[PDB]
């Protein structure tokens, strides 16, 4: 029974380490109906204490809703596409919002203390506990497991958030930062408000540590803490022991944990299947280049008019699975990192970079055949932008060298939104050729758009950052070139001289 043993031992370990006694002593010192605080920069660690007025019984269940686009929302970093909103307990939110004033400077102090590798603890009693959590959740707006994060220790506090919040903080790093010390005699009304984080439950003859929120629900659903800390201290040298939680809860915790471990191993196993799928895409791309179309235009045509058997399999089996897998990977690692030195260690990061640069063009084809505009700023999905950012962060720390006498045939274009630009340019050109009664300010801005695109194209060609397959006869880039050559006239430039003399037929040789 791994989970039962761990829970008992971890409660025992935290009790022996000695943070409850120090934190509670500081709380007792600040105490023995407003919001106050104290700061102690001891040699061991910097410790911040909040005190706050007693508990309102009538106002126990009111909450304020927040939203991403709302501007009074202080925590916009933690709401997402699957959770665009969350709601918070009202009185503690008001206390925190009022106190924001000088704890801005305190935030500078505490973040600077953390960056120098010293521990920081934020703690409070019952209502001051909730406020403390808010302050901690305010400091956590920047996370990487290379750098430190605060720890919150909370003695007998009410819940603050609802199920949307505990869904945001379900299996993430931001859970590991909270520690709620609650006697087994307190009962909670969890119809609306929910628990997040890790809990320490203090029985009479021992204590237990539980990280699962279902079990907290099953144990606490429906005191004075100096005595319970004394009782734990005395029970430390007990001569006899029982099991303080029932075995039904143990079975539940074990079951869920085993499921989670299996699902962790599953993606490590499935990455190799994904690589065989990409190999199929490689041979598809090779044939699409042998027939002088390019795989982007072949994919687009066969999406409009399906006629072939290989292409339906490409789209419906290989690309669909690849998209599903990589969305899952990005959804999972951006709440729970790898390797504690970098999320997405090295096989996932470099495979994901290759996947993005091979597979996004087809997502652009789908987007623009379906009848949409402005892909880059309004259309591309989250996992693509995350993959680009994470790889670019590390690509600056590695040494490499690009030869100027190579064969570029098998290069993948570094900007995976190249075809989005081409589609936008084609849209603009046809809107010029088809419009009537159009003003001249708009005509001038459209000419600005064309000149901008010309600059972008010449700067990727000259830098050797595009693949020669954009020069294949039945490409869309060549349709853009033909129509722009018509609507241009004789205004010669660098790009026009490159194309006209037919020097594009030796690029990348």
């Amino acid at each position: 029974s791994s989970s039962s043993l761990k829970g008992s031992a971890l409660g025992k370990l935290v009790v022996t380490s000695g943070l409850l006694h120090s934190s509670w002593s500081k709380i007792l010192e600040i105490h023995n109906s407003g919001l106050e605080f104290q700061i102690h920069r001891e040699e061991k660690f910097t410790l911040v204490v909040f005190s706050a007025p007693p508990i309102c019984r009538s106002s126990s269940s009111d909450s304020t809703l927040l939203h991403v686009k709302d501007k009074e929302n202080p925590f916009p970093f933690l709401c997402s596409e699957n959770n665009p909103s969350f709601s918070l307990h009202t009185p503690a939110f008001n206390l925190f919002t009022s106190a924001s004033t000088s704890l801005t400077y305190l935030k500078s102090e505490l973040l600077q203390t953390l960056k120098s590798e010293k521990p920081v603890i934020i703690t409070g009693a019952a209502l001051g506990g909730s406020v403390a959590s808010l302050y901690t959740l305010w400091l956590l707006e920047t996370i990487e497991p290379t750098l430190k994060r605060p720890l919150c220790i909370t003695f007998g506090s009410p819940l603050i958030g609802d199920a949307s919040l505990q869904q945001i903080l379900e299996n993430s790093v931001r859970n590991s930062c909270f520690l709620h010390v609650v006697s087994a005699q307190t009962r909670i009304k969890m119809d609306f408000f929910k628990p997040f984080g890790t809990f320490l439950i203090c029985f009479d003859s021992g204590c237990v540590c539980i990280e699962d929120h279902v079990a907290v629900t099953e144990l606490l659903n429906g005191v004075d803490y100096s005595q319970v800390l004394n009782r734990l201290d005395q029970s430390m040298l007990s001569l006899a022991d029982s099991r303080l939680i029932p075995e039904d809860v143990i079975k539940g915790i074990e079951k869920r944990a085993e499921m989670k471990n299996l699902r962790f191993d599953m993606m490590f196993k499935k990455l190799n299947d994904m690589k065989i799928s990409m190999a199929y895409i490689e041979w598809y791309k090779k044939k699409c280049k042998e027939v002088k179309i390019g795989y982007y235009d072949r994919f687009k045509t066969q999406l409009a008019f399906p006629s072939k058997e290989f292409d339906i399999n490409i789209k419906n089996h290989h690309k669909s699975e690849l998209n599903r897998f990589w969305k899952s990977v990005v959804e999972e690692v951006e709440r729970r990192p790898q390797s504690d030195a970098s999320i997405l260690k090295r096989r996932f990061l470099f495979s994901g970079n290759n996947y993005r640069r091979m597979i996004e063009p087809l997502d652009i084809a789908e987007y623009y055949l379906e009848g949409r505009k402005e892909y880059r700023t309004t259309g591309r999905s989250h996992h693509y932008v995350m993959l680009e950012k994470w790889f670019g962060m590390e690509s600056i720390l590695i040494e490499k060298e690009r030869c100027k006498k190579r064969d570029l045939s098998d290069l993948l274009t570094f900007d995976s939104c190249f075809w989005a630009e081409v589609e936008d340019s084609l849209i603009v050109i046809n809107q010029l050729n088809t419009t009537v009664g159009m003003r001249d300010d708009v005509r001038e801005v459209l000419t600005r758009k064309l000149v901008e695109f010309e600059g972008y194209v010449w700067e990727i060609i000259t830098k050797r950052e595009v693949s020669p397959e954009i020069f294949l006869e039945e490409s869309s880039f060549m349709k853009w070139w033909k129509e722009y050559k018509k609507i241009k006239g004789f205004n010669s430039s660098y790009l026009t001289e490159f194309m006209n003399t037919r020097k594009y037929e030796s690029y990348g040789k």
Binding site: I312, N313, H317, S320
Partner: protein
């Protein structure tokens, strides 16, 4: 070579002459034709085809990891060199065109041949047309034919009227070689034929609701590949399906991309034995009237990636033997009464490792599951609850055979 072949393989090889040059033919086409022409079994005809590939007289390529089950050969290419077809032609011009047996005819831009005014005595007639064909049909007599093949390239097509004159027809095949689907019309003429038993179409734009309207009283099988269905209507209850279609047993729908909803009438063929909807990637669900097929034996749904669940009325299929859901990636959970089927013996569920087996599957006996190893993790826990279970595992070998269909 041709003479060195035994008698039967002589005409089996001679039948190859009717298909256009370098045409990638699936092995089910000629197998169905041969079954109706020669009354033999499908298995032994596949053995003859393997034999002809052993003497290096044709090429046989599998497209995937399907086995040679009962007459499911929609997954094998027959591919023949030019000169082998030319040799197969060589043996059959000895007799005269009006009294040939195997005659291949060509029509280029409505330049009809001037001997078709006569009375043709072929029993296996093929017709080829080009892009410019305008469906100005000459009137011929062809009373000796039992088979018929129509190669197309047109944007629009009308079946000839003299089809009603072939009182001896048995088989029918239309293949479109154009870029965009052909619009077939003038199709009701077939209602006069008393002997039509198998029909096959490919890459043609058909309003599927026609078949009940057409009184195909003797049709045994109907197969569609890559067809387009257009606007899916349903509201023609005027015609009793079970009386017009008294002899229909198999329907094979393959690669029909736009079919998002299965038609209403196929639930009313109580003579159904097989039903096969494979590679249809817009089909998300099946009608709850499928439980009205009380005599359905086989049911294949291979490689339909978007099908999320199987309908409940699968309880009512009391005759189901074979049940194939290989590579059904969107399938989540089998129906919760799947264990009430007291005849289900086999299942293939390769790549269905993501599908949750309900409890009552323990209420089955002597079943053989074919699956990959990741699927077996679902099938290994429940072993000691099943007195005669077999779980046979093969492996996916990888090849580029489908790059022929590019």
């Amino acid at each position: 070579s041709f003479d060195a072949l035994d008698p039967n393989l002589k005409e089996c090889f001679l039948d190859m002459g009717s298909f256009l040059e370098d045409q990638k033919i699936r092995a089910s086409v000629i197998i169905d034709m041969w079954v109706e022409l020669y009354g033999k079994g499908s298995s032994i005809l596949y053995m003859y085809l393997e034999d002809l590939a052993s003497q290096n007289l044709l090429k046989l390529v599998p497209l995937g990891t399907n086995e040679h089950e009962d007459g499911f050969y929609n997954d094998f290419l027959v591919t023949q060199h030019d000169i082998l077809r030319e040799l197969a032609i060589c043996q059959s011009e000895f007799k005269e065109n009006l009294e040939r047996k195997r005659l291949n005819l060509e029509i280029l831009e409505n330049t009809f041949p001037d001997w078709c005014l006569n009375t043709i005595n072929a029993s296996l007639l093929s017709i080829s047309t080009d892009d410019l064909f305008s469906s100005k049909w000459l009137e011929m007599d062809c009373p000796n034919v039992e088979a018929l093949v129509l190669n197309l390239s047109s944007s629009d097509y009308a079946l000839p009227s003299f089809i009603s004159g072939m009182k001896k027809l048995k088989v029918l095949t239309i293949t479109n070689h154009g870029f965009y689907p052909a619009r077939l019309s003038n199709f009701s003429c077939l209602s006069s034929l008393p002997n039509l038993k198998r029909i096959r179409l490919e890459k043609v734009s058909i309003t599927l609701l026609d078949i009940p309207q057409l009184q195909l009283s003797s049709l045994k099988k109907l197969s569609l590949v890559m067809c387009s269905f257009g606007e899916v209507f349903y509201d023609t209850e005027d015609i009793v399906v079970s009386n017009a279609l008294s002899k229909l047993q198999e329907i094979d729908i393959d690669y029909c991309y736009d079919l998002d909803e299965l038609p209403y009438w196929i639930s009313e063929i109580v003579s159904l034995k097989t039903l096969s909807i494979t590679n249809c990637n817009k089909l998300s669900q099946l009608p709850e009237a499928i439980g009205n097929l009380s005599r359905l034996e086989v049911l294949r749904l291979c490689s339909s990636m978007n099908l999320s669940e199987l309908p409940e009325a699968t309880e009512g299929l009391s005759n189901l033997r074979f049940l194939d859901i290989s590579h059904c990636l969107g399938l989540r959970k089998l129906p919760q009464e799947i264990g009430k089927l007291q005849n289900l013996k086999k299942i293939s569920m390769r790549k269905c490792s993501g599908c949750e087996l309900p409890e009552s599957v323990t209420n089955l006996e002597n079943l053989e599951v074919k699956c990959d190893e990741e699927t077996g993790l679902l099938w290994e826990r429940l072993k000691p609850k099943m007195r005669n279970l077999r779980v046979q595992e093969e492996e996916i070998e990888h090849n580029l055979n489908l790059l022929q269909m590019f």
